[PDB]
């Protein structure tokens, strides 16, 4: 619900899709690809779990 | 090495919060570190969208996030509320916006227009 | 602290690949981490300058 914010201070809500976009930007990948392939990415994550 | 001689990106290594710097302090048979960290203080709920439609094209913030007060939309920093007008400099375009989920229609301001008039 | 409460740039620390997020899981006298990592999949040759 709060990404990494709750680990560095007060927890701040954020949509999980936008949190994954934050991660994608962190790994050096443009966030737009996440929104363009969100369904596929979520499917892959569920399959991996 | 990582807290005093530099700014560590590791979480909770050089203190709790966003690390800024540290100051060593000698102790008998030990050492004391004074980790200075940046901590967000006061929150505010905002309505946010992953992108924006201007002319059938999806717009995303180059760095920051789209937020919306009661009426208007702005692009602000990820760790501090500094709203700004949605401009072509603040955002980058990518394809059309019939693919993104949750996109919201809005105008994207063009800095070139006012100067082109003169 | 690093893998769960944040995104780590350390290679092969929070699993192998480009770390995105991790999920802790309690175990008897131990802990289990589910490291989610972005992994390039399909390569393609290009000429670069």
Swiss-Prot record, chain C:
Included range, full protein: 1030 to 1078 of 1273
Highest taxon, organism lineage: Viruses
Chain positions carrying an annotated carbohydrate: 45
Protein name: Spike protein S2'
Disulfide bond entries: 3-14
Main function: Subunit of the fusion protein that is processed upon entry into the host cell. Mediates fusion of the virion and cellular membranes by functioning as a class I viral fusion protein. Contains a viral fusion peptide that is unmasked after S2 cleavage. This cleavage can occur at the cell membrane by host TMPRSS2 or during endocytosis by host CSTL. In either case, this triggers an extensive and irreversible conformational change that leads to fusion of the viral envelope with the cellular cytoplasmic membrane, releasing viral genomic RNA into the host cell cytoplasm.
């Amino acid at each position: 619900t709060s990404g990494w914010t709750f680990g560095a201070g007060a927890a701040l809500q954020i949509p999980f899709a936008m949190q994954m976009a934050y991660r994608f930007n962190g790994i050096g990948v443009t966030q737009n690809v996440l929104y363009e392939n969100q369904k596929l990415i979520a499917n892959q994550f569920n399959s991996a779990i | 090495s990582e807290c005093v001689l530099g700014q560590s990106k590791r979480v909770d290594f050089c203190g709790k919060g966003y690390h800024l710097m540290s100051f060593p302090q000698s102790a008998p048979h030990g050492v004391v570190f004074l980790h200075v960290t940046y901590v967000p203080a006061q929150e505010k709920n905002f309505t946010t969208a992953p992108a924006i439609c201007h002319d059938g094209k999806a717009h995303f913030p180059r760095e920051g996030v789209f937020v919306s007060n009661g009426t208007h939309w702005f692009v602000t920093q990820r760790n501090f509320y500094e709203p700004q007008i949605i401009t072509t400099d603040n955002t980058f375009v990518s394809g059309n916006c019939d693919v993104v989920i949750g996109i919201v229609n809005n105008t994207v301001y063009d800095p070139l227009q006012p100067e082109l008039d003169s």
